[PDB]
């Protein structure tokens, strides 16, 4: 006492028509020709759409199909008059993937590469879409596939192996699904322009002499920087314990120890220092700024 | 109709509706006088030879008698009963005995003034149950179980029949969720002469549980004095004895015991009452 | 240690696996589809008819004495572990696959603990080789709806077997063991 | 005009004797019979140890050999009278490895296992010794080799994969080198006893009302803990800005917010909170304490 | 960009590789042995006689015009890269092997940049297939002292070739190119 | 010995030692008187017929004459020269011309009072060099090169010969380290009439460098006032011209220029001197 639904697991586009049939097995197929009804995603379809062909076949006509509710596909169940489940099917609908855009990558201490892209199409998110990252050298190299995905979020990959310097790279993203395949545009990227480093650790703020309106902020340069290819540039900011506004200090690129001025005596301040690499032996453009260090509070000795 | 002195007919009507009620197949130009419960009716209500009732309330039910004008000659008697169509019943089942079957009742949220007819049908996947009932109070299937861990969700439906309407309600459950035994019986607490700040509470096992040794229960104890009115919860393992050390020197305590299976079902109701006094040397 | 701490460890592990299986089954039913997400959803079982059931009578459950129960639990747990390991190819989600791998590791550890409990009581049956036909059970050609039905029935049978194993461990710790 | 030294790359023990010969190739081998001398690690050996056999062979006798200076082996070079390098050889000496002892492992949030062992023998450090870690279940499992070594220091390994709970493990270390092989003793370890978690983040200290001698410390429980298997126990400590001594607070296991007492008004204090798991559903013994969180400074409003 | 930025990039990369090779050679000489750690240590070269040398006359160095120099640099850099990649099996140290892999990647990138510079000037010879006999060069049977001598001579020849390539790039950027 | 009127013999003795000096094969009981530089000696110094000198200093060298008693009859003449055995020489070579060969000198740290004999021998791996020298001043090999990037460390050794002792010293180097050209010549600075706070400095190329176009040099400039006495370093690229904007309105400056190859060798010495004055309208 089972039924068969045809076609089994079809593939259509958004807006195309659909024709399915449910044939029950019964020796006196009189009442079964009209007792069967269709159900889509737990919702009973109106009887006006279904049509009867003969005693052992039911017809269904649907049009202007929309996106799938889930990635597994919509469920079309042919139910009996008493509510029994006779047969089932799955519907896969979507749109072909387009070329991804807005691809950006950054390198941390020239030891790893992390890229982030955006699909940019609303038709590919319905079906399961495959995303692969390919990177290679421009003049002499072979295609290499990235393995560690989702290192920072959706649509991202992590390259833990070291990459060659002073050589441009070609990075593109390929999209593949059940419908079609698309490739993104080739992007020429230089590692020396996306250099990112860690914030300077060991932030210590100490008083100097008996001055109540002056302090001293010293730190240690990050050991990850080789100091041979570029020079970092530091920046200091401070705030009041009860105030949310931040006051920024000008470039302190060279001085590892800087003294503030204009501070109010008898007040606790929080100091956060960040560093940014510069361009040496190449493009003089600076790199991406790093995150702020942990806040180190100090008290000014009042008079 | 038939001869006048026969048994009167019963007619039902909804609340607040409008109906006409004539006595027999008499002509419209006849002298008709109506009476209810032995008193005459005003002529301003008769529509010729028929009687129309506009928006009946509950105080209009009774025996509608139609007599001759200025006489006591009866022609037609009808009993009018006003009621309300039934709503969806409330169905929720519970197994008082885990090794045996379960039982449950059905009742309407709004009471009606007409006796209804009920239907019982249990599916249990694809099968047929009995629901045999010879109880004291009605509305109890008292079905019996047949297997253990059948991995089949039970399905029962309740139907209501009435001359004004009908309704239906069906629920689904399993044998693991609806499990709740009865509270313990004979909860008596006795003091201890050695320690004054100590109380001994002893309870028993409800006789409904057929196998208390195969399916053990996990008891619960709640103790609270009368003036602080604050309950403190404590969970106990298998055993019908407890030793509480939070008793006062000269204050009374109220004890309440519950019952529940080891890892099946929910908690049951507390005990009826309990009173005890600590030890005092004098 | 003997049978004192081992039975308690097995009970705690069965409770933890029951909780994790409840969570995983809720997640899988929410991910499967709207029809499989319904509260009742009781269809006739036709897709999965090869996995062992957990339906037993009361007298039959009381007749076994510490050996047939443990053997049935071991074989059913091995079959369920194999089925859940094969079930990994169906789901496509990072956190879902991570939870599946965690539950598979926990179930393998529970099977090992059950084997150790069986070997500790002094029963000359450490591991009687069962099956070896379904030892891998490669996924055959089947439809998507039938696959979802098989997954739902497998999850329900795993929950039922966890409940039955917890009940059996409690009975063994209470009646047959001090 | 080359020489040959025999034996080539021998293997001896600490204290054994050594016999090597250097035969030069020359048609009138008269002066070459005594012009050759031995050199070990750039040091000229005394001529009293070397002996002459005939015109085209030189003898050398050494005893009580000691440990190698480098792992590659000592270099024995047969030099000519003018200082030319004729031939060379390498000497490998050491001692067989013993059974390692003092093995300890710890688990972080029940998601990884890190073990640390100690060789304990001074004879194996001279030659290259192989260290492998094997872990498996006691009753049902197979041998598994750890891959990520040196995750925290020397003689350590990291197991990133998840491990089964409520089941003891058998961990042993195997030592193998050019001389022999040894295996450590089997250690039974339970993961529920070495549970380690991260310190509670989001440490915020704020004032309460107008009290100058009281503060409030609140934090957020670590989301890594599932809260189902065990319960953590917190501990708070504080110090004076100008004092190095630390004052510890008693168990604050349950309260996520705790108030200090006895503080001096008009003073900046640094608060560091750490948490420690306990034993639930098993052994009630506590676990390994975690590291202290980042110091959060707060000022007490003076009167 | 043409030959403007490419030659400067190659010069900077050659300087960086020279510094890294100096550091790596110092480390390898400190790790090799006391005799190889001596300041002078000038023995006759007998172990390594197959790698290409970097000895050229002045007139011969001035006669070549932007093609033979680049071809010789390319082939010598490929040979040195293959030898340094094969040299990884000798050293046994985490940081040393990491530095070796970093230097190998940097040398491969420098070879690719040199090939790109050759292809950018419009020379109809992007990559004329050299060798293919030493393309892998598996380590044959040899003694330890001979292996250390080969490693020392390879490091010295790599340093000399780096110096010669830096000089040639400077000459090309100064005289033949604006 | 031979005839008294023959050329005297030369004998060398160390410093502070002891030595006897007899004149001829005469008997021990003969009348012997000695004379130095034309004056007679004291009889308290003669040991019979010999003359002993205890702890000789530098002031005892000269002509030791032995005559007959109370006469001018000569018998034996001998010149005495006191010296010091040689120490290890100081050897450090330098290539003034990179395309051509190199040259270097050798000298003792402590000067001696006896002319020594020197030896020169260069190995260059396994080879033979010439060290041909026809220079103005001595101690200069002036060797010539034969290859480029030979990857062979040069080895040269210096030996010293003397009647009191000998020594030896050998060093090793390569053609890439010992490279240092000569400082520039004709450093003249001229002012500029347009900008007062600006100075123009021009220098030349040393004529020793044979190929200044094939092997370019990287110049260096140093400027400083006379009253400020603080030098500020600035590095220049290829070119014999510079434009400095740090000049004062009425202060003088001293300029010094150096020389060095592009990436081979070390820096050279500064210029001799330079004087200039800024522009002033009056
Ligand atoms: C009832 O109608 C269905 C649909 O028209 C018939 O099924 C078709 O049968 C023909 C030949 O028998 C096949 O070529 C088609 O492919 C079938 N279509 C489908 C959708 O199944 C069926 O045969 C009819 N039955 C009777 C008794 O007339
Ligand atoms: C797919 O989208 C179409 C377009 O919105 C839906 O069609 C509408 O359906 C509602 C209710 O059934 C009607 O009231 C509208 O008149 C329909 N509009 C059109 C243009 O047809 C359709 O219901 C959607 N289907 C699903 C499964 O979501
Ligand atoms: C890709 O990047 C482009 C460039 O920034 C984005 O275009 C701008 O998007 C912002 C934000 O919506 C708008 O305010 C601007 O008006 C857009 N400019 C132009 C010229 O279109 C674009 O939105 C990005 N796309 C994605 C998918 O992130
Ligand atoms: C009072 O009785 C008269 C007579 O039966 C009713 O008049 C009839 O009304 C119905 C419905 O409006 C019509 O179909 C008939 O044709 C009417 N008959 C005549 C003779 O007019 C009248 O409606 C009644 N009044 C009330 C308030 O019920
Ligand atoms: C006519 O008399 C009958 C009999 O007493 C009345 O019916 C009772 O009404 C009261 C008041 O509503 C109810 O509490 C009783 O339950 C009724 N009894 C039965 C048997 O139904 C009726 O209400 C009277 N009608 C009038 C109009 O007075
Ligand atoms: C069965 O009972 C339900 C519950 O009261 C009825 O649903 C109500 O119907 C009335 C009239 O149509 C509405 O005014 C209410 O809002 C409905 N309530 C709900 C909760 O749906 C239903 O009509 C009954 N069925 C029959 C056949 O009488
Ligand atoms: C309500 O209960 C009645 C009493 O059992 C049912 O009537 C019987 O139904 C069965 C099953 O269809 C038939 O085989 C019998 O012949 C029926 N007997 C009579 C006297 O009718 C009725 O079907 C039930 N209704 C519902 C909706 O469950
Ligand atoms: C010089 O002495 C060496 C060592 O005794 C001789 O070498 C041995 O020769 C014999 C036979 O010729 C071999 O069996 C040994 O194994 C050799 N030993 C070594 C260490 O080489 C050598 O033959 C002698 N030469 C002469 C000319 O007498
Ligand atoms: C190995 O150790 C032994 C023992 O210390 C060393 O032998 C000593 O050598 C020194 C100098 O050569 C002598 O003064 C001692 O008398 C020796 N002692 C003994 C007991 O022999 C030997 O030199 C060491 N060898 C090396 C290569 O380090
Ligand atoms: C291995 O652990 C044992 C036990 O702690 C260590 O033995 C103790 O070591 C300390 C430190 O040297 C001594 O103060 C104790 O006297 C030792 N106790 C005993 C009983 O020996 C042992 O040193 C450790 N070994 C290694 C290699 O770390
Ligand atoms: C002074 O002259 C006498 C005679 O030559 C020296 O006496 C001789 O001394 C040497 C060495 O002490 C002996 O070997 C001789 O046998 C001695 N000869 C006699 C005859 O005694 C004496 O040493 C000289 N004095 C000094 C200070 O040189
Ligand atoms: C004897 O006369 C000679 C000749 O002048 C002296 O020799 C000179 O001594 C001075 C002083 O030390 C030196 O500066 C000269 O260089 C020496 N000249 C030569 C040619 O050697 C000698 O010192 C005198 N001796 C005594 C004892 O008076
Ligand atoms: C070669 O010159 C060296 C350097 O002066 C001499 O070494 C000195 O020798 C003396 C006497 O033996 C010692 O007092 C010094 O301490 C030594 N100095 C050094 C630095 O070693 C060496 O003796 C000379 N060789 C010869 C044969 O005269
Ligand atoms: C010092 O220099 C002399 C002069 O060249 C060397 O004497 C010659 O040495 C070569 C090489 O051994 C021989 O072929 C000649 O026959 C030698 N000539 C003479 C006149 O002796 C001497 O060997 C050098 N000494 C050192 C130590 O280098
Ligand atoms: C996506 O890629 C994975 C591995 O690269 C593969 O197993 C899977 O079948 C792919 N899916 C599609 C739709 O191409
Ligand atoms: C930064 O500049 C100062 C003064 O100009 C100098 O002393 C310091 O060395 C510079 N920093 C670096 C990293 O060179
Ligand atoms: C140590 O192990 C590694 C890999 O397991 C192997 O390549 C090496 O040969 C081993 N060394 C020894 C001395 O066994
Ligand atoms: C800790 O104890 C307090 C009071 O006893 C309670 O309110 C709180 O819920 C406990 N903490 C946890 C995690 O249960």
Author numbering:
A (entry chain A), D (entry chain E): 39 to 341
B (entry chain G), F (entry chain C): 24 to 305
C (entry chain H), E (entry chain D): 34 to 211
Paper text:
Glycoprotein 130 (gp130) is a signaling receptor shared by interleukin-6 (IL-6) family cytokines (or gp130 family cytokines), including IL-6, ciliary neurotrophic factor (CNTF), cardiotrophin-like cytokine factor 1 (CLCF1), leukemia inhibitory factor (LIF), oncostatin M (OSM), cardiotrophin-1 (CT-1), IL-11, IL-27, IL-35, and IL-39 (1). These cytokines share a canonical four-helix bundle structure in which four major helices (termed helices A to D) are linked by three loops (termed AB, BC, and CD loops), as well as three conserved receptor binding epitopes (termed sites 1 to 3). IL-6 and IL-11 signal through gp130 homodimerization, while other cytokines require another “tall” signaling receptor, such as LIF receptor (LIFR) or IL-27 receptor subunit alpha (IL-27Rα), which forms a heterodimer with gp130 for signal transduction. The extracellular domains (ECDs) of gp130 include an N-terminal immunoglobulin (Ig)–like domain (D1), a cytokine-binding homology region (CHR, D2D3), and three membrane-proximal fibronectin type III domains (FNIII, D4 to D6).
In addition, we have solved a 3.40-Å cryo-EM structure of the CRLF1-CLCF1-CNTFRα complex, which exhibits an unexpected 2:2:2 stoichiometry. The two CNTFRα molecules bind to site 1 of the two CLCF1 ligands without contacting CRLF1, indicating that CNTFRα may not be essential for CLCF1-mediated CRLF1 dimerization. The elbow region of CRLF1 D2D3 engages CLCF1 site 2 mimicking the interactions between gp130 D2D3 and CLCF1. Therefore, the CRLF1-CLCF1 interface has a much larger buried surface area (1480 Å2) than the gp130-CLCF1 interface (944 Å2). Notably, the three gp130 residues crucial for engaging CLCF1, W164, F191, and D215 all have equivalents in CRLF1 at similar locations, i.e., W177, F204, and D228, respectively. Furthermore, the way LIFR D3 captures CLCF1 site 3 is copied by D1 of another CRLF1 molecule, CRLF1′, in the CRLF1-CLCF1-CNTFRα complex. CLCF1 F178 is stacked against CRLF1′ G126′ and is surrounded by N113′, V115′, I123′, and C128′ of CRLF1′, while CLCF1 K181 coordinates with S110′, N113′, and C128′ of CRLF1′ to form hydrogen bonds. The two CRLF1 molecules also directly contact each other at their D3 domains. While R245 of one CRLF1 couples to E279 of another CRLF1 to form hydrogen bonds and salt bridges, H332, A335, and V306 from one molecule pack against the same corresponding residues from another molecule to hold both CRLF1 D3 domains together. Unexpectedly, CLCF1 sites 2 and 3 are engaged by two CRLF1 molecules analogous to how they are engaged by gp130 and LIFR in the CLCF1 signaling complex, supporting the model that CLCF1 has to dissociate from CRLF1 to bind to gp130 and LIFR to form a functional signaling complex.
